[PDB]
């Protein structure tokens, strides 16, 4: 199952890289680092949690921007390698207005773009250098480049003419992307 993309018609003429760069700037950097972790401000959360789930989700400390990662995710906390998110990410959904997550699934009230069949997978022993950790931490720290790089590779695996510099409408014509 190759990467599949859903997008709001709004973004049809945007490139995937343009959308990711803009969304990351709107979201900002939650500053989840030693000495700066503020529960309920920059922790986000898991479903079901508390440290593991089929989803991890977080909203901006300032804007309405949010994302949801779907897969099977595990946070090591103090277990070596400490502060590592690992497991699998199948889907990343970007947009604004995070809802749910505590007895029900996290969802975006305004889902803008969703990338599924991502096939992201990393073991605990890879630590913070694992592709799951890099991709998801980048999205909450103001750097969408790890996710853009992974999407670029997945698109080129469908056809070398496709890239993150393709527009959503281009990927729609190629059968990879679909409106809504």
Author numbering: 1 to 180
The article reads:
Recently, we have successfully expanded the scope of available synthetic metal complexes for heme substitution in the heme acquisition system protein A (HasAp)16–21 which is a hemophore secreted by Pseudomonas aeruginosa under iron-deficient conditions. Herein we report the dimerization of HasApf5 derived from Pseudomonas protegens PF-5,34 by incorporating Fe-TPP with a phenanthroline (phen) ligand as an additional metal coordination site. By the addition of Ni2+ ions, HasApf5 binds Fe-TPP-phen to form a stable dimer structure with a bent configuration.
Furthermore, HasApf5 capture of Fe-TPP was stable even at high temperatures. The Tm value of HasApf5 capture of Fe-TPP was estimated to be 60.5 °C, which is relatively high and comparable to that of HasAp-bound Fe-TPP under alkaline conditions (62.4 °C). The crystal structure of HasApf5 with Fe-TPP was determined at 1.45 Å resolution. Its overall structure is similar to that of HasAp with Fe-TPP (root-mean-square deviation [RMSD] over amino acid residues 2–180 for Cα atoms: 0.397), and Fe-TPP is positioned in the heme-binding site with coordination by His32 and Tyr75. These additional hydrogen-bonding interactions appear to contribute to the stabilization of the Fe-TPP binding. The result of docking simulations of Fe- TPP-phen into HasApf5 using the crystal structure of the Fe-TPP-binding form indicated that the phen ligand is anchored away from the HasApf5 surface, suggesting that the formation of HasApf5 assemblies would be possible through the addition of metal ions.
